[PDB]
Amino acid sequence: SLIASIGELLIDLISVEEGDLKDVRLFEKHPGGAPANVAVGVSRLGVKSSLISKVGNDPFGEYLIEELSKENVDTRGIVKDEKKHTGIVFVQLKGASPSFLLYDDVAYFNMTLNDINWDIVEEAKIVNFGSVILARNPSRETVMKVIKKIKGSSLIAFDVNLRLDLWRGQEEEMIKVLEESIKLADIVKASEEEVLYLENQGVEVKGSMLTAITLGPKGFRLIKNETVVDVPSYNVNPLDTTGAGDAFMAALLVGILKLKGLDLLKLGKFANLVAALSTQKRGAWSTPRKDELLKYKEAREVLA
Amino acid sequence: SLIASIGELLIDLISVEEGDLKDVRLFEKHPGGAPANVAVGVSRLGVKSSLISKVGNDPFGEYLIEELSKENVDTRGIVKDEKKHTGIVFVQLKGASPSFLLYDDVAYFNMTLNDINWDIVEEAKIVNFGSVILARNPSRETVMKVIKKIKGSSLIAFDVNLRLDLWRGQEEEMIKVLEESIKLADIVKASEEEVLYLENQGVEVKGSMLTAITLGPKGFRLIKNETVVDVPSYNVNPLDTTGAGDAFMAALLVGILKLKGLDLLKLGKFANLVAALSTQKRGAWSTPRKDELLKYKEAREVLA
Ligand SMILES: Nc1ncnc2c1ncn2[C@@H]1O[C@H](COP(=O)(O)OP(=O)(O)NP(=O)(O)O)[C@@H](O)[C@H]1O
Question: What positions does the entry give for ATP binding (chains A, B)?
């Protein structure tokens, strides 16, 4: 029962104080990258996890592999780039206007077909990927080729996770690769904003097997073949919602992998529980551990 | 008179705690880059200073330009790159073995001939550069062409500032460029360690007009045509010596510009004073300001 994530793996330099990145003085270093965040979540839920990515031959690349190893995420598919350094992004999560500065000339955007460990990806039942990694070549063509290649042997999950800043000057190609990725996906996760934006350009944001649309404060919605199920969010006191989204995706993939048929109700309750609890942990890796979850019936239904 | 510096301008992310960069958790952001440090030093000493470099069209590029402007440094020659981000370097100054992680695929290494403001360069009486910017093309060929084109129309200063990590795989090409740069230099500055490294590979570390060899805390030595002067450092209890070298250079260049002749005595004392006092300020921009210097006889002789 393997779940493989392929994409960006990087260092998040999170602003410690408020203000535009221009005026932030202090930063905290943490591991980041949607695919890596989900990989860690999947692992915490008790499912063997693998990450396919590329870091530089430097201290930060070493740091990320170490942190991933501590979470028991299979790191064999993470290649070290001798020319490009570990990906980094400076982020400001605070304030009404969260912002970021992502360095694109880095290792994870430099993946080529010869970097892919095919044994690992062919061994997975579900392969997860996002749009961020597709923002630049060679990683874009590489990822698309890998997906097209394993289609049929593995369920393909795609988190839209759209970041317009990463496509300035190539919006036409963006629409094309996103649409192509969606059509290749059995599982598609997106926000209503992303659904509107995309559909407002002739692109239908839907998975062939399952679609999950996040509604921010209203919770989320699980759509399958005209059968729609809405799930309001739990009312709790969040300490940090930074990793909620990826905690949700992890849960959703683990649930799909675990339950016989795709029972939207049980899946929704499980996903919801994981996300809700993730808000009680700090950081990008806030997914709760299997243990903390067994105390819940909505979790035993999928993990136990 | 105007002194122009050409080279790296970047963001220094300084480790807050000790330890390997892999483990450092907190980093403080500050403006950095030898040429920029010298540019600021020159302006503080009351001389018109211009910096020729390239930053990204991003928050950090804006931060650097703003900071330089607060120091009255002419930034007209600082170009914004639409394709590369602002240079950055993660730094560990603490410990027995300080280290760094310099991101090389950044804006300041991507300078082309059309990025150079020739008006500013030609108008300068002294043009200063260092070896770091020569680490990668196109900046390397660009800087060499500029120096060769003004050679003879302006004094040329070169701070060896040797960083081996930046030349791995190209150690031989390194020696060639340093040799040629030193030979194009009227004024050469280097530490005794560097002198013993180059001359040990058939490289003579000497300027055609003046040579400055530093000896760390002990002091420095000014050499001009077989005339060797030893300047023992003034006694001080250092708060931070990070910017001492660049403060020394800024002083050395302002002295050379102001002094009718090349009185190595009036030059030594001045540079010695400026460097010594710089140890009383924290950070890469530690050059004392002119107003703090007018209280010293050794300084008035040069500025007043
Ligand atoms: N503790 C100190 N007390 C007095 N003067 C100092 C002290 N440390 C440095 N200096 C002065 O500042 C000058 C700068 O030297 P240093 O910091 O070694 O710069 P550098 O030669 O560029 N070395 P680097 O660029 O770090 O490889 C010295 O030659 C001294 O004259």
Answer: 189, 214, 219
Could you tell me the CATH number of the domain that includes residue B301?
3.40.1190.20
| Residues B302, B267: Cα–Cα separation, whole Å | 8
**Computed over its alpha carbons, how large is the radius of gyration of chain A?**
18
Query: Would you say A183 and A158 are in contact if contact means Cβ atoms under 8 Å apart?
Result: no
Task: Outline where DSSP puts E strands in chain A.
Answer: 3-6, 10-15, 26-32, 49-56, 73-74, 78-81, 87-92, 99-102, 126-130, 155-159, 187-191, 210-214, 220-224, 227-231
List all residues 6 or more positions away from B245 whose beta carbon is below 8 Å from its beta carbon.
B34, B159, B161, B214
Domain that residue B86 falls in: 1-304
Q: Which residues of A touch B14 (CB under 8 A)?
A: none
Separation CA A102–CA B17 (nearest Å): 24
* Residue matched to tokens 């250092």: B238
Question: At B303, is the secondary structure helix, strand, or coil?
Answer: helix
Documented resolution in Å:
1.9
Q: Residue B284: what are its φ and ψ, rounded to 5°? A: -70, -15
The answer to whether A248 touches A275, Cβ cutoff 8 Å, is yes
- Judged by CB atoms closer than 8 Å, whether chains meet at A25 and B28 is answered as yes
Angle CA A97–A102–A108, to nearest 5: 145
**C-alpha gyration radius of chain B:** 18
> Across B153-291, where does the E strand assignment appear?
155-159, 187-191, 210-214, 219-224, 227-232
**Alpha carbons B37 and B21: distance in angstroms, whole number:** 23
Q: E strands, B7-149, where?
A: 10-15, 26-32, 48-56, 78-81, 87-92, 99-102, 126-130
Using CB atoms within 10 Å of the CB of residue B265, give its burial: 0 to 12 exposed, 13 to 18 middle, 19+ buried: exposed
For residues A125 and A3, the answer to whether their CB atoms sit within 8 Å is yes
CB atoms within 10 A of CB A202: 8
Question: Amino acid identity of A181?
Answer: S
State chain A's maximal CA–CA distance in angstroms. Answer: 52
| CB-closest option in B22, B60, B104 to A63 | B22
**Matching residue, tokens 């036409």:** A172
**Structurally, how many domains does chain A consist of?**
1
Q: What technique was this entry resolved by?
A: X-ray
What is the SS3 assignment for B70? helix
For residue B2, what is the enclosing H or E element?
strand B2-6
Number of helices (H), then strands (E), belonging to chain A: the values are: 10, 14
Is B101's CB within 8 Å of A21's CB?
no
Pocket lining: B191 vs ligand 1, CB cutoff 6 Å: yes
Show the 3-state SS of A64-101.
HHHHHHHCCEECCCEEEECCCCCEEEEEECCCCCCEEE
Note if the bond before B138 is cis, omega within 30 degrees. Answer: yes
**Residues B116 and B52 sit within 8 Å (Cβ to Cβ):** yes
Q: Is the CB of B92 under 6 A from ligand 1?
A: no
Q: How many CB atoms lie within 10 A of CB A229?
A: 15
- Helix (H, G, I), strand (E, B), or coil: what is residue B228? strand
CA B181 to chain CA centroid, Å, is 14
> Rounded to an integer, what distance in angstroms lies between the CA atom of residue A115 and that of residue A117?
7
Q: Do B29 and A29 touch (CB under 8 A)?
A: no
